[PDB]
Amino acid sequence: MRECISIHVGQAGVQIGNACWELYCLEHGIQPDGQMPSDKTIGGGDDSFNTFFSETGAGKHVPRAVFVDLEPTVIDEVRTGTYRQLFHPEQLITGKEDAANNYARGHYTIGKEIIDLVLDRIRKLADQCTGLQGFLVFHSFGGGTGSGFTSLLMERLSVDYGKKSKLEFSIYPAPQVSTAVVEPYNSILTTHTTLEHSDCAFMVDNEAIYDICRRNLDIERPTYTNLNRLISQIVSSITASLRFDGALNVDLTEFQTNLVPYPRIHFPLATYAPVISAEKAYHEQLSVAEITNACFEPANQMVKCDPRHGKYMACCLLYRGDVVPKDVNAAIATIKTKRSIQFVDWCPTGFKVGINYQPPTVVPGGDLAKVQRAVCMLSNTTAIAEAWARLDHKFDLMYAKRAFVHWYVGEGMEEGEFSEAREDMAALEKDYEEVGV
């Protein structure tokens, strides 16, 4: 058994982490007090769920998690929430002044004051690991802490844990639920600094989650809780292979091996189905063929783009529930005759498939209906470069007038870091074009 440590940075990372760890406890039968009646090895064990949970002598299953935020109000909810007993105070790290939506403040000014404290607490989790695989980092692109402190932490993790893997769950900024005009700045600044430190990054666009919540859950104005309930399901079906018995994506290294042929092109596109409303009493259970075909509808992707006008480098199908291999291959055989699936010439046109018979768990009283079978498709398509092109364009509009730049230089940043970060993104857009065009 090899352990995975989760790190949640900023409001978006913390609130999402709280939703993920609640869902994890429901999936593994871990009560809010930390007890797990199904676990017969008291105070130890090398089971699959021990990748995310350690065990105390009293039988409490403690997440291998650390929450960090430059202000205390969001993490205080973890100290008060239903799963407060799950964590010990050392896992919850808070500062005084937040980054005020300013990457320079989260990275340079305030992050530098707290970076050693965070690393020491992570080291305390790493010392309890017999064989750490690496880290899962949850953060926003637009937040001052989610962008600023994360890129500082990712730099330091590559130093202190050079042989370890680092996967990212990143919230791409959407104006409908944004909090700052400078989120394009923070998004590009943190991508430039984190690029060579992340082995695989899963971008979730809030625009896609918002619209999926509106059109599939009939939610008029989705709040953060609505979005995080859906995001937690997508994160769970991605990390399920690390928490349960399986053979696909069983360690963080296999995520890079199966999805990232080129190191810079490490942003797989996630597609999840089905999303059914709980208020919908009469529900018709979708088949394997129907949910697999839904993996190719852009309205079900975590980032809105058109994979038809791109090229696939890698594809992974993660099924949960009543799915048999034969049904998958019949669905794939039908889909290839109809859909536009173009792979690059230097890669095999194929799918790595993983099935876990346990159907998805939904939060009781939530908006999501319990289904018999669901699938998450991870596909590294060049089409996700559209999201970079949109983001770089919004960056170029503000930066052409140097708007808001003084708040960053005022914290010790240099104007050249902006252009240096933008040139990298320009090179990244070129890397995607050279692969798929």
Partner: protein, 310 residues
């Protein structure tokens, strides 16, 4: 009040569509780089499809189908027609072509040498997306030093009196629902030389009745509608914007040749076509009616023929 932007000032068709949109009083033209628009009359090259359908609270419509260039580029049309299972099976209406990179060099000469061996008609036209027509394959390959080598219709239908060659231009509108509308009016561009140079359908129909005892609909237009439907249905799974965050429509220009046996051949598809001077007003109004007002309604026969498909 709907908003639209103009990003192709050279488009004579959509300069008229823009003129009609403002003449309704319910459309407002914004600056070309204003993202808060409903309709984009976009540019022919490098249209930022990746930035459409991302403005909150806006239904955005563009006048171009992303990926439609596969049909409007001569080399892409040949490869598409040759590799698509829905087309390559037939293609009895498409002249024999070969994509020759400056590759099917061996396959062209194989069919070419067969024609000279059998003393058959061995005249091929080479073009790109500068044209040379020759009966010697050596002159063709040297002319292109990506091009395509197509068979030149050695037996075209010649209008009389005048012994003149012609082509047929048809305008096809595809809306956001992927309905295929064929404009009722085409044009015949006469060569004016023995084998303003524009003959419309009413006269051409009368000629076919007088000279050949048949009708345009029966002798030519059935094959035209068949070719238009085959080409557009073939790429529909690749370009449709049915469940997309933005919607697309596009006006196409199909170009046909007619041989002396009243058989219709496809020549090219134009993604950015101009119109006939007499027909600009009617067609641009139909574009507003079925392609623009359908998505953005405003506060009777049809000038289009709806090519029915599943």
């Amino acid at each position: 009040m709907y908003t639209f932007v103009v990003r192709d000032e050279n488009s004579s068709v959509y300069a008229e569509v823009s003129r009609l949109l403002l003449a309704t009083g319910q459309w407002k033209r914004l600056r070309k780089d204003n993202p808060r628009f409903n309709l984009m009359l976009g540019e022919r090259n490098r249209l930022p499809f990746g930035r459409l359908g991302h403005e909150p609270g806006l239904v955005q419509l563009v006048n171009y189908y992303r990926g439609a260039d596969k049909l409007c580029r001569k080399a892409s049309l040949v490869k598409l027609i040759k590799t698509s299972p829905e087309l390559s099976e037939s293609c009895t209406w498409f002249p024999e072509s070969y994509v020759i990179y400056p590759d099917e060099r061996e396959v062209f000469l194989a069919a070419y040498n067969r024609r000279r061996e059998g003393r058959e008609g061995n005249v091929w036209i080479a073009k790109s997306s500068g044209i040379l027509i020759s009966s010697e394959a050596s002159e063709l390959l040297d002319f292109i030093d990506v091009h395509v080598i197509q068979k030149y219709l050695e037996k075209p239908l010649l209008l009389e009196p005048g012994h003149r060659k012609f082509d047929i231009r048809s305008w096809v509108l595809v809306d956001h629902l992927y309905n295929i509308y064929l404009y009722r009016e085409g044009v015949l561009r006469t060569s004016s030389e023995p084998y303003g140079n524009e003959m419309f359908f009413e006269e051409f129909n009368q000629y076919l009745m007088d000279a050949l005892n048949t009708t345009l609909e029966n002798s030519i237009l059935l094959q035209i509608k068949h070719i238009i439907r085959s080409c557009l249905m073939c790429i529909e799974p690749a370009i449709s914007t049915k469940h997309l965050h933005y919607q697309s429509f596009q006006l196409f220009g199909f170009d046909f040749m007619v041989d002396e046996e009243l058989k219709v051949w496809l020549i090219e598809v134009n993604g950015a076509p101009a119109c006939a001077q007499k027909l600009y007003a009617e067609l641009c109004q139909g574009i507003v009616d079925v392609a623009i007002s359908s998505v953005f309604p405003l506060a009777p026969t049809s000038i289009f023929i709806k090519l029915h498909h599943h």
